[PDB]
Amino acid sequence: FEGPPIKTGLLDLTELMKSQDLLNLNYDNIRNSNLISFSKLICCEGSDNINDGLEFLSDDPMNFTEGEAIHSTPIFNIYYSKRGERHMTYRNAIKLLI
Amino acid sequence: MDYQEYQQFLARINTARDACVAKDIDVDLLMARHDYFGRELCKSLNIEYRNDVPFIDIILDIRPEVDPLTIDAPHITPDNYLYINNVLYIIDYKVSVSNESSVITYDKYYELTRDISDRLSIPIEIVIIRIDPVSRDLHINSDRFKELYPTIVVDINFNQFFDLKQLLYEKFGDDEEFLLKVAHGDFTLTAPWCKTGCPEFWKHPIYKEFKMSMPVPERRLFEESVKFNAYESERWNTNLVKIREYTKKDYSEHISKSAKNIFLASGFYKQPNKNEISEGWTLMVERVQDQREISKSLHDQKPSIHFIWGAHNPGNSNNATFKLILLSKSLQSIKGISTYTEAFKSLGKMMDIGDKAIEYEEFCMSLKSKARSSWKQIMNKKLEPKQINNALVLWEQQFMINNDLIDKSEKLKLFKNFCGIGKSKPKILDFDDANMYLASLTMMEQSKKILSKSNGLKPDNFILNEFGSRIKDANKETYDNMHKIFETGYWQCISDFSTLMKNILSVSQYNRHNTFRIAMCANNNVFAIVFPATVVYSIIVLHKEEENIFNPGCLHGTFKCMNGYISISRAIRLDKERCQRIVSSPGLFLTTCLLFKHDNPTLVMSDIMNFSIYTSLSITKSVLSLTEPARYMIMNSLAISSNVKDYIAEKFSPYTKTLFSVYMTRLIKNACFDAYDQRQRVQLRDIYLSDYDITQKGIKDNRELTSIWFPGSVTLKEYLTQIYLPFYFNAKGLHEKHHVMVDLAKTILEIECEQRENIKEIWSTNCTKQTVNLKILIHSLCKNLLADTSRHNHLRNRIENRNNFRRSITTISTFTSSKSCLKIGDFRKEKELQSVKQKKILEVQSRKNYEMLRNAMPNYTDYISTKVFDRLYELLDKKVLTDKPVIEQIMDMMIDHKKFYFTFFNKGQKTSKDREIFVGEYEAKMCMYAVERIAKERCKLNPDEMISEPGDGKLKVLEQKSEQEIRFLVETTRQKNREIDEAIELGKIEKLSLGKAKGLKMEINADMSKWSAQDVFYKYFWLIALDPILYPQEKERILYFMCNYMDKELILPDELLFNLLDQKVAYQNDIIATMTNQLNSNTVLIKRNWLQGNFNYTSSYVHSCAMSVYKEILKEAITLLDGSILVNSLVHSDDNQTSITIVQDKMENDKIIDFAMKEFERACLTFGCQANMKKTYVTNCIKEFVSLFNLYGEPFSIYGRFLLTSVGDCAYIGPYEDLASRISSAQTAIKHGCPPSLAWVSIAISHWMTSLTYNMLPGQSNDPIDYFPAENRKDIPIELNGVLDAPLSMISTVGLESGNLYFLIKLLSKYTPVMQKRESVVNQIAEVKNWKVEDLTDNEIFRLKILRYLVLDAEMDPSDIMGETSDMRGRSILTPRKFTTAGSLRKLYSFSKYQDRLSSPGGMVELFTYLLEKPELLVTKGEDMKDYMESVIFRYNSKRFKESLSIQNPAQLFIEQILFSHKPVIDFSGIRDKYINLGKVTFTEAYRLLMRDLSSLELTNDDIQVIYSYIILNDPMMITIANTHILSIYGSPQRRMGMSCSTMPEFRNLKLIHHSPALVLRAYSKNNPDPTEMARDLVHLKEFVENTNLEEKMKVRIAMNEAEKGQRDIVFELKEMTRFYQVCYEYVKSHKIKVFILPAKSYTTTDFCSLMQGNLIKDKEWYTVHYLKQILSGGHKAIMQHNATSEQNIAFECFKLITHFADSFIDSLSRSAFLQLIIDEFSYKDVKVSKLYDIIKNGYNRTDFIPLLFRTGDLRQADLDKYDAMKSHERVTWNDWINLTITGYNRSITIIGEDNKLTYAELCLTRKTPENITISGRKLLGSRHGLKFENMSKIQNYYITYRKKDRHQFVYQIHSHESITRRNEEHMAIRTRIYNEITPVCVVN
RNA sequence: GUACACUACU
RNA sequence: AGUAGUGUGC
RNA sequence: AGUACACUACU
RNA sequence: GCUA
RNA sequence: AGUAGUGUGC
Ligand SMILES: [Mg+2]
Ligand SMILES: [Zn+2]
Secondary structure, three states, X not given: OOOOOOEEOOEEHHHHHOOOOOOXXXXXXXXXXXXXXXXXXXXXXXOXXXXXXXXXXXXXXXXXXXXXXXXXXXOOEEEOEEEOOOOOOOHHHHHHHO | OOXXXXXXXXXXXHOOOOOOOXXXXXXXXXXXXXXXXXXXXXXXXXXXXXXXXXXXXXXXXXXXXOOOOOOOOOOOOOOEEEEEOOEEEEEEEEOOOOOHHHHHHHHHHHHOOHHHHOOOOXXXXXXXXXXXXXXXXEEEOOOOHHHHOOOOOOOOOOOOOHHHHHHHHHHOOOOOHHHHHOOXXXXXXXXXXXXXXXXXXXXXXXXXXXXXXXXXXXXXXXXXXXXXXXXXXXXXXHOHHHXXXXXXXXXXXXXXXXXXXXXXXXXXXXXXXXXXXXXXXXXXXXXXXXXXXXXXXXXXXXXXXXXXXXXXXXXOOOOHHHHHHHHHHHHHOOEOOOOOHHHHHXXXXXXXXXXXXXXXXXXXXXHHHHHOOOOOOOOOOOOOOEEEOEEEEEEOOEEEOOOOOOOHHHHHHHHHHHOOOOOOOOEEEOOOOHHHHHHHHHHHXXXXXXXXXXOOOOOXXXXXXXXXXXXXXXXXXXXXXXXXXXXXHHHHHHHHHHXXXXXXXXXXXXXXXXXXXXXXXXXXXXXXXXXXXXXXXXXXXXXXXXXXXXOOOOEEEEEEXXXXXXXXXXXXXXXXXXXXXXXOHHHHHHHHHHHHHOOOOOOOHHHHHHHHHHHOOOOOHHHHXXXXXXXXXXXXXXXXXXXXXXXXXXXXXXXXXXXXXXXXXXXXXXXXXXXXXXXXXXXXXXXXXXXXXXXXXXXXXXXXXXXXXXXXXXXXXXXXXHHHHHHHHOXXXXXXXXXXXXXXXXXXXXXXXXXXXXXXXXXXXXXXXXXXXXXXXXXXXXXHHHHHHHHOOOHHHHHHHHOOOOOOHHHOOOOOOOOEEEEEOOOOHHHHHHHHHHHHHHHHHHHXXXXXXXXXXXXXXXXXXXXXXXXXXXXXXXXXXXXXXXXXXXXXXXXXXXXXXEEEEEOOOOOOOOOEEEEEEHHHHHHHHHHHHHHHHHHOOOOOEOOOOOOOOHHHHHHHHHHHHHHHHHHHHHHHOHHHHXXXXXXXXXXXXXXXXXXXXXXXXXXXXXOOOOOOOOHHHHHHHOOOOOOHHHHHHHHHHHHHHOXXXXXXXXXXXXXXXXOOXXXXXXXXXXXXOOOOEOEEEEOOOOOOOOOHHHHHHHHHHXXXXXXXXXXXXXXXXXXXXXXXXXXXXXXXXXXXXEEEOOOOHHHHHHHHHHHHHHHHHOEOOOEOOXXXXXXXXXXXXXXXXXXXXXXXXXXXXXXXXXXXXXXXXXXXXXXXXXXXXXXXXXXXXXXXXXXXXXXXXXXXXXXHXXXXXXXXXXXXXXXXXXXXXXXXXXXXXXXXXXXXXXXXXXXXXXXXXXXXXXXXXXXXXXXXXXXXXXXXXXXXXXXXXXXXXXXXXXXXXXXXXXXXXXXXXXXXXXXXXXXXXXXXXXXXXXXXXXXXXXXXXXXXXXXXXXXXXXXXXXXXXXXXXXXXXXXXXXXXXXHHHHHHHHOOOOHHHHHHHOOOOHHHHHHHHXXXXXXXXXXXXXHHOOOOOOOEEOHHHHHHHHHHHHOOOOOOHHHHHHHHHHHOXXXXXXXXXXXXXXXXXXXXXXXXXXXXXXXXXXXXXXXXXXXXXXXXXXXXXXXXXXXXXXXXXXXXHHHHHHHOOHHHHHHHHHHHHHHHHOOOOOHXXXXXXXXXXXXXXXXXXXXXXXXXXXXXXXXXXXXXXXXXXXXOOXXXXXXXXXXXXXOOOOOOOOOOOOOOOOXXXXXXXXXXXXXXXXXXXXXXXXXXXXXXXHXXXXXXXXXXXXXXXXXXXXXXXXXXHHHHHOOOOOOOHHXXXXXXXXXXXXXXXXXXXXXXXXXXXXXXXXXXXXXXXXXXXXXXXOOOOHHHHHHHHHHHXXXXXXXXXXXXXXXXXXXXXXXXXXXXXXXXXXXXXXXXXXXXXXXXXXXXXXXXXXXXXXEEX
C-alpha cells in the first residue's frame, strides 16, 4: 500500500499496514511484542492519554493458540488457534504492550 | 473449496454407513468438482457463470422478440453460453481425464444444434473446455473461441477432491456392493492371446514335484483353478470366492492364534546396549583374525594417500627449465649410501641438461610446434633423442634411459625391486592393537601439524574469484569457511596433487618403455618421475628442514642433498580410473569440508579438513570396508530394537591395510557406544495443526548429539548426514574382475549347494526356513486378487494397452535396446579368430586361450554375447519372429523355448561386496516381460506397493503416511482420553493420569535376507493360477514357462574358466569344481534362486500380501486390548517400511514392541520371506525407505551424494556438454533440500572441472577473456566457455537457458523506459522499438550478436508469429572433432548386413529413398519389421552410434580431451555457415575468427525484437520465469521449521495436440488421418510448418547444396529431413515427476514459483514471495504472446486484504469511513484502488464481494439473486406440533398429514427430470424432519420412502415405484448384509 | 528416437 | 542385466 | 619401419 | 589399434 | 614397490 498518512488520535494506520510485527492474528505475539515495533505507529500532535488514542482499534476477540501435550512415547506438543476470552481483544494486547 | 462446504462433505462422509448413499456422495463430489472448475474458469475468462439455462433462455437473450410457438429447440442444457460478434458459443465444462466424454457430447450438441443453426440465421459454435485434474491441462475444442481468448489464466487445484475420493474409497474398500457401484462398466476381457494351451505342462517334472508337495484338496483346487475360465462362468469371482471360503477356517484360526500371542510376550526385545556391542566386537575380532592375516609391525602399512608433500620455496624460480635443472642437480647430490641411491643419482644424471637451457627449449618448442600443426597424429616420422649435455632428450620432459650412465645391476635393481617390473591370506593391520592405533593417531596428528599452517599464497583461484559473490550473499559463513579452506596447507596439498596427477596422466600417455618422464606442478619443490593402464610414478619432494614433510605412509626415504633434503616416495602403480578420481579430488575435498562444517560453530575446521583429506583421497578397498557397514552399525546402535550384535559378529569385516583405516575403525567403534548412549536426546518439534495441513513438524534442532568423525556437538539431521554421507566417498569400479567373478560365482553356488541338500520340503506351518504356509498364502492371494481386480474392471485392457501387447515387438523400447543379451549356438570360428588375433597382438607387442578351455571341457555350452537390437534383427531376418502382435509370439515362445541359459558379470559398484548381474537370452526377456507386466499393472492398483510409484515420488508417499499417522495419533489420544482430561479440571489427579490411554508409534525399517536367492518360487504358481483376468490356456502356458524356468542353467563366463584352468593348484574345497563336476561343464542347474530383478513386481505383490496378513494380525491383536491401530506398510522389491501406530490402555509399550517384532518375523517367514534382522531396525521417529528419510513428517534426504557427483564422469564431448551434465548434478541436489550456498559451491566446482578438462582455467591457454569484450567469464556466454550467471531458482527451473534468459532480463531492467519498468515482460518487450543501440555496451552488442546470428537465423523477422523455441535449438558451438576409428564390430549380425549393403551394386540408394519417402521413422519407431530393419541398418551411418557400440572408459576420453587442446579440432566452417552464407582451427583462433566476423555484422532494433520474440515470447515457461524475476516482492524472513514435498507443475497449461507425437508425425507423412478426427491436429502442424517456413528453408538448403555439389544428394537430404521431423516432433509433444523439498506445500503454479524463489536465496531462512502482477501467459508453446493479462487478481487481493485488515484490526464503530478513505485515496501494487474497485464493480463476480459491495452503496438485487444460486442452503419451517415447508433454491416441498397418515405431498422444482427429483428429494429431506413416516401404503410415480439403518438411523429420499422395487430386489441379493426394506409412504406431486 | 551421466531397488 | 526414474547432448 | 604431447603457475 |  | 585377494591375478 502506497498511501498518504492516516492519523487517528496518536496512531498512523498506514504505518500499521506497513508494520510486520503487529499484524499477527495471535493474541500472544502482540501481547509479548516489543516497544520498537510499536514506536513505528505513534504520531500524536497533542493528545493527553493513551486510552483515548487507542479507541480506533478492534474490540473483537482474537484467535489465539493453546498447546497441549499429546501423551505419547515420542512425546510432543500440538499447537492450534482458538478464540480467546472477551478480554483478549486487540486494544488489550496493545495496552499490555504499552 | 469453501472450507465450510468442505467440512459438510467430510461430515457427510464420516456418517456414511450405507453402501447406497456413498454413490450419492461420489456423484455430489464429481459435480462439486465440475461446478468448482466452472466458477474458476468463468472467473478467469471474466464471463458470467451461468448454470442450468436451457436453449429457450439463450434464444430469448440473443433474439428477444420471437416466441417459442415458432420453434422447439431441444431440451438439452449447456454448462454456459456466450454470444459475441453475432456468433453463439455453446460452452460445456469437463474435468475428465480423457476426451472420450468430450467427443460424444460434442457430437450430441452439434447434431442437435444443426437444425436450429440455419433457422435463426446465426452460427452456433460448440465449445468444450476439458481440464485434466491430475495435471492441469486445458483442451479447448473451438480454435475460434481461442481467438477470442488468447490468454487464459486458470491456476486451480483438484486435490481437495482427490483426498475425499480416496478416503471415501478406503472407508468402504472391502465391501463388494459399493465396488459394483463405482464400476465403470462391467468385468470385460479381450480376445485370447492364444487359441490352445500346453498339455506338456501337466507332465512336467517341476509340476509333479509341486503337486506331490501339496495335500490332496489343494491339488484339486489348483487343478480346477488353472482350468477356470472367467469369461465362460456367470460371475468371474466364483473361483476366488470358492477357494477363499475353503481356506477361511485355517486362515482365521492362524490370525487368531497369532493375535492371542499379545499376552504371551514379555517386554524383553533385542535392545542395543554397550554389553552387546562389546560382545559383538569380540566375536568380530575373533572371526577377522581367523579369516585374515593380522600384522603388528608398523611398516606393513599401505599408503593412506599415494602422495607426499612439502611446502613451496619462494626463494627459487618457478620456471619449468629451472625446476628441471634443480631436480637433476638435487638428485645427483644425494649424500649417503642407501639401497637405491645409485639409481637415483643415475636418474638425476640422465636428465641433466647442464646449462644448455636455450637448446632444450628450442628443440622442445620445435617438436610441439610440429605436433600442434595437424589434427591427426604425425605419422611415419621417427623421433630421435637429441644429445643435450648429459640428457638424451626425446621430447619435453622425456629422457632416454642411458645404459652408459647407469649400471646394469642398479638399473635391474631399480626396475625389479622398486618399480616392480618383473616382480596366503590377506595381510591387514591390527585395528585392535594399542601400538597400531597409537601410531595411527600420531600419523593424523603429524599431518594436522604440517597441513594446517597457512600457505603464504593468495586464496584467489577460479572458484573463489568467479563464484564468491553468489556463495557470499547466499551465506557469509560459507564464504568465510571456503576462504579459510583456501588459506591453509590442506588446499595447497590437494591442489598440487590434482595438478600433479593431471600432469602425470598427460605425461604417461606417450611414455615409452625405455624413457622416463618428469611431471611438475605449481609447487617448485614437488616433482614426479613417471617410470616406463597402470601408471607408475614416484613423488619427489625437495625440502629445507628435515621432518617438514607430509607423510601419509608413502615415503620411501628422506635423504640429505645439497641446499636441504630430498624425499622420494615409494613407487605407486595406479589405474587410469583411480588417477581420474585423484584429479577431481579438490572438488570432493571442498564439498565434503563445507558440507560437514555447514551451519555448525561447534566444529573445528582443521578437524574436518584432517578427516576429509584422507577420505577424499582414498582410492582403495580399505575405506570401502568401513563406510558402508558404518550405516548399519551406528543406526542399529541408535535404534530402539536391533541386532547390532549380530551385525558386528557376523557381517562387519574391517579391512584395515592403512593407518587411516585403523583410525576410522576406532571412530566407528567409539561411535557405536556413543550412539547407544544418546538415543534419549532426540526431541520433537512442536506440531502446528490446522485441520487441513501440518505446518512446523519434524525434529528439534538442538546440538546435543556427539559427532562421529571429529570432535564436537551435532544435531540429528547433521548426525544422520555424518552416518550416511561417507558411503558416497567410495569410488565405483575399484573391484578386479578376476576376484569378484569368483566371489559372485562362489556365493551363488554355495546357496545352490545348500538348497540341493538341506532344503527338501516346500510347504510348512511352523515358519521354517524357505517354506511357505500354504493355506495362508492361498487365502491371502484370494483376498488381494478379489480386492485388486474388483477395483478396476478393464484391467486386461490396461495391461494390453500400457505394455503394447497387441502391437509389434519393434515398438517396445526394452526389446530394441542396446544392452547385452545372450545367445546360444555353434560359435567356434569367431572365438578362434579373436583368440589368434589377440595372441598375435600380444606377441607383436612383446617382440619390441579359448581352445585350451574348449578341449579340456567336454560338456561346454557354447555362447556369445550380443546387443539386444542385433538379436531382434537376427530373429526377424531368420523368420523366427514376425511383425504380428507381440503377445501371441510370446505365448508361442513360452512353449517353443525349453532351455534357459543365463550368464553373469560384476556390477562394479561402490559397495564393498560387489553385486551379481545376470544376462539372459532374448526369449527369456520376452517371457519375463509378459509375466512381469501382468504383475506390474496389478501392483499399480495396490497402494501399499511402491515400485509402481514412479521414481522419487516415494519421498512424497512417505510424507503422506507420516502426516496421516500424526493426525491419527492426535485424534485418537484426544478421543480416548477425553473424559479423563475433562475430569482433570493435587495427590488425586496423578493416579488418575496413570490409568489413561497412552500412545505408541513404531517404525520398522526392514530389509530382507537374500530376496531372490532364498525365495520359494512355487508360490508364484498360485499367484498365476488364481488370476481371474487370464484364460486357462494362457495360465497353462505361463505356468509351463515357469516350470521350464526352474530348470535353467547358469553358464559360467569364459574368462572365469580361463582363470580357473590356469590355476595350477587344486583348491581346497572348490565349490566351483564340485557344482560343475570337476570343470567338465560350464553350466549349473539353478532351481530356487531366480537370478536378480527378473521378478520385481511379482515378489513385491506377494510381499504386499504378507504385509496385509501382518496388518490383519495386528488389528485383531489390538482389538483384543480395546484400542485403536493404524498400520501402514510401504513395500518395494525387498525394502520394507512398516509404521505401526497404537493407542491402547491395557499393557505396557514394551510388550507391544516385543509382540510386534516377533510377529513381523513370523509374518515374513510364513510367505517364504525372511526379515534381515541384522539390518532391520525399529525406531520412533526416523523412517527410512529406499534411501529416503522422513524424520517426523518432515522429509529428509542426503543431498550430499548429488553434490559429490558434481565432478563425475561425462561424455567428454566439448566444454559445454560437460558443464551441462555437471549442472544437472547440482539441480538434483537442490531438489533434495540443499541449501543455496552449497549449491553454488557445487556449480562452481562444476565449472572448475569443466575448465580443467579443456585448459580454460584463468591464465591457461584456452582462456577466452582476452579474446572477447568481457571483463570476466560471467560476461561470456556459456556456449563460448563462460560461466553460468543466473539466479539459483531460475537455474533449477529452466536450466542452462537461464544464462540467455537472465541476460535478456538484465537488458530489460537496464534499457526500458521508466514508466514501463514495474510491468510484465510482454509489456516491456513491446518497448524494444524505443531502444537506441548506439549506447549499448560492447559486451551487450557482442552477446546480442551471439543470440542473433549464432542462436537464431538471419532470415527471421520481428513480425512472425510461430517461430521455434529454445527446445528446438541445439546449443553447442565449439565442439572438438576427434579423429577416431570405429571399432571391431565383427560380432554383430546387422553390422555384417550393413557391410553387405555397402558393397551391394547400387543398393544403398534404395535404403536412402525408402527412408526419405517414409520419413517419420527418423525420429520414432517403426510399426512393422521392415521399418525397424531399415532403421537398424541406417543407424550405422552415424559415427557416434558406432563408437557407442565399442566399449570405452572415461579416463582415456579425459586424457585425450586434455592432450588434444592445442590441436586444430574446431571445424570453423560449420560455425561460419550459421550466419552469412580453411580446415580445422584451434580454440584461440576460433575465438579470434568469430570475434573478427561479428564486428562486421550489424545490430538494430529489429534484430533485438527478433531476439526477444524467439527466446522469451515463444515459450510460456520463459515468460512466467522472466515475470517471476521482474515482478517479485520479498517478504518476512523465517526459519524452515516444517519442510514438505511438492511436485513441479507444468508451466505450459494449454495443449493443442491431443494425439501422441509419433502418431501425428505418421499421419503428417501422409495427408490422411488414420485416428478419431485429427482434423485439428494436422492443420495446427501445417500452420506451424508454413508460418515459420521450415519447408522452404529446407528446400533452400538442399537446393544450395545441390548447386554446390552438382549431383543429386540424398544423405544431406536425410539430415535435413531428420532435423525437420525433430523440430515437428518437439512441436507436437503431447508428464514428469519432479518433487522438490520446499518450506510449505505448493498447490498451484504461482505458489510453486513463490516457494522456489523464497527458498533459494539464503541458507538460514526463507522468504514469502508475492508478485506484482500476473506472472503467467496463455500457453501456445511455439507461438508469440503479444497480449498481457487484465489485472483482476490485483483487485481481488486488494479488497480481500482491505476488508480483513479493517475488521480484524480497526475498531468496529469506524470501518466504513476507513474503507472510503482507503478507496478514494490509496493504491495497491502501484494501481489506484479506486480503479481496482471499478474492476470489481464491472466484473461478473460481484457475488464474491457482497460485504464489500455493501457499506458503500454499489449493490443490487441481481447480485443477491446470482449469489443465492451459488451457495444454496436448506430452510425448514413449522415446528408447531401440520404442514411443513422445506424451501431451497428453486426447490420446495409441502407435506400434509397427521401423525399416522399423510394425505398428499407437493414438490416444487425448476425442472422436472428424474435425476433432479431424487436430488431435490435427497437434499430437502436431510434437515430437521418432524417424524419417521411410520406407516405404509400400497403403491403404484414418485413416493417418499425410508430404509432402516441400525440403531435409530434412516435415510429420507424420493424414489420411483419401479426404483423402490429394483432396490428392494438388489438388497434382496443372497448375502450377509441384513436386509432393510425401503417401505414407502405418501405420494409426491 | 539415439548416446551419456546420476540416484535407487535388486 | 533387469527395474523405477531424472537430466544432458544430437 | 614408425607409432607426435598436456601443465609451464603468485609458489 | 593405426599410417607408409 | 603398487593394486587386488581368507582363488594363485595385474
Ligand atoms: Mg530400509
Ligand atoms: Zn504528542
